[PDB]
Assembly symmetry: C3
Homo-oligomer: 279 residues x 3
């Protein structure tokens, strides 16, 4: 676009602290600040070409780690036990993530860039595949922008983790709010044991990298329903209420017993007066 904000060229070196901690109720979560850990962990958004040094501190009583999808990392920052890149209790390690722009290789072929919707999670809590860590909440989203990507007003993360959304008790959302016309970005991630189908009432997106059609040539299927499995991640943007107006629009897993057993939430799209028709 040319009036929406778009991502700039990347290439910063960025530093950042993360903590893994046990939560009072038995869950585990990441944070940028000790005592401010969340499930999902905080969004990490960078631009293609950025380099990110994460001073990670495991504050728990068991070994834990930080593993990322899609981004360039050396085996040093694998986050696995095998490759000795996990972290002892109370320990601190610096993971490094790099990203790159697309371009021609010398053999004439086209190297894909790092741009996309990704995620990070533990790889050593409970099992050598982080099964316990993931079940407990050690997962969070990563976004890598390509230069020129359209930027949203807000970004929400929805994680189907086993039979929960964002580790919440059945039928407790989360719910999100927008005003009609808002540019809303969704990062959607699945974890655990089961397949799901993500569905949104009243909105749809493109089944490509960005969730947006480039222009009239993009043959990508347009959808409002997408099957997902453990560690899948995709994202998209929509205009809230576009062509459909305000309302309490559901989103849910469309697997019938999942939605029945509580994998449901609300996308509350409001008129400017903050009202929602019949809610």
């Amino acid at each position: 676009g040319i009036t929406a904000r778009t991502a700039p060229a990347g290439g910063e070196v960025r530093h950042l602290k993360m903590y893994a901690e046990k939560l009072a109720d038995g869950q585990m979560g990441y944070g940028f600040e000790k005592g401010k850990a969340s499930v999902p962990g905080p969004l990490i958004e960078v631009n293609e070409g950025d380099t990110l040094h994460i001073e990670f501190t495991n504050t728990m009583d068991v070994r834990a780690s930080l593993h990322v999808h899609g981004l360039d990392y050396e085996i040093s920052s694998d986050g696995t036990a095998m490759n000795k890149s996990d972290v002892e209790p109370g320990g601190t390690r610096t993971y490094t993530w790099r990203t790159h722009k697309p371009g021609r290789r010398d053999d004439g072929t086209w190297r894909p860039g790092s741009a996309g919707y990704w995620h990070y999670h533990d790889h050593v809590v409970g099992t050598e595949h982080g099964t316990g860590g993931i079940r407990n909440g050690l997962y969070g989203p990563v976004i890598v922008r390509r230069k020129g990507d359209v930027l949203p007003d807000a970004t929400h993360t929805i994680v189907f983790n086993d039979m929960t959304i964002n580790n919440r008790k059945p039928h407790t959302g989360p719910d999100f709010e927008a005003t009609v016309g808002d540019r809303v970005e969704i990062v959607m991630i699945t974890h655990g044991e089961y397949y799901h189908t993500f569905h949104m009432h009243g909105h749809r997106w493109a089944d490509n990298r960005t969730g947006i059609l480039t222009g009239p040539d993009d043959p990508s299927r347009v959808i409002d329903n997408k099957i997902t499995g453990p560690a899948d991640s995709f994202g998209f943007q929509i205009i809230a209420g576009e062509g459909v107006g305000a309302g309490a629009w559901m989103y849910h897993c469309h697997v019938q017993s999942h939605s029945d057993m509580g994998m449901v939430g609300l996308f509350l799209v409001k008129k400017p007066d903050g009202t929602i028709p019949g809610y």
Copy 2:
């Protein structure tokens, strides 16, 4: 194409009656006419820009509704209990579905059009997610054509609903018939509890919006096998017997115990004399 028939520009306002009724054997189905209800319900095909007013009448003894994927609807035509848009027994409600062409937004971005393979189903029978209604047969296909889309000779709907095809008893098809050379469109929909993989012997299509490659630039994978989950919908066209000739070509779920337990049917492609080699 330029010799195949193609869809015209849309923009009609269309009216239409639908009924939901209980069938003699305990199933539930939609119809355009009372007493002519089917599972799957009738195809609804429109053009991008069309508006469709459906005079829906619930003739059953329990509340029922009509919910659609992909198409523009206001929350009034949500078809959910929450938003008060379901229908009392013997009641009548007018749902409205709109569709739109793609184009530029003012922010410079590209709005996707409504064009695609979609579906409709109940959202309130049995549970607040229509689990009972869907299991009983309250589902049907919707097609939205983009101006210039290639039109087929015939359109067949295949629905993997839990462990059945089109709610049929195991190993009872459906079977479809074509003559070699026919342009056959398939709308494929999944419902219920399970994932599946749809497979066709002897034919293949594009994994994009239409199931057809635009021309040589379309990088879409060409496939004869596709994993699907509850509420997924896609469609495609093939030339019957193209490059392979007449025959009784199977289609089935490729999940091994599903095909074994009966999720199988026949695509009977005939020579002009109506014969099928070795059948």
Copy 3:
């Protein structure tokens, strides 16, 4: 590309022998030579336009067959019981597979070519859907190249067959080896009863036909995680260790209990001295 090797135009008629045999331990596998049967069966790679005549011999004590995805075959070479194209014990049959280039049809539309990542398997051992044959190991990969496709240094086949990789005992790989910079092709196939998610540490590919982006216009999502179901097949190429260096990079099903129960292997990327950092 223009320095990588690329596939030539097709159109050869090729002949070839295959055998199905029972293995000493109770499995079943295909081979190009009697006594040299493998699970997965040997790669069959051809060019668009090639024709392949396979002199198939069933050396087992039960009926068996050869069924292929994606490629053109007449119903004579269906490989099914129904269509009488399976093979009696000790019997010999000649299957024929053809392939075609894409191009314009007379109706003006675009016929897709045969190019892609496909597979072959039994259709009659154990059940009329080859459930027993597939479980026992009667499956192998097929690659059809389009003229101009980039050719790799090596091609590896990974098959998630029920809860095994390539029918191996849990936690026994397979492992693959490359040197940093190698062009590695992966053909990934799923069989049996379950869905999976294929994941690779440290590498990513395009979710299109080839696994490679054409250039900057290709909107295909770039991924390192892909959900798959029975009879799904896709493929891709990566540069070993590109942007990430040498190391013992894991690949696994990301379904948590699968990786835990053993669906894991190693992509061993080496420095030229053959060493792998921390292994």
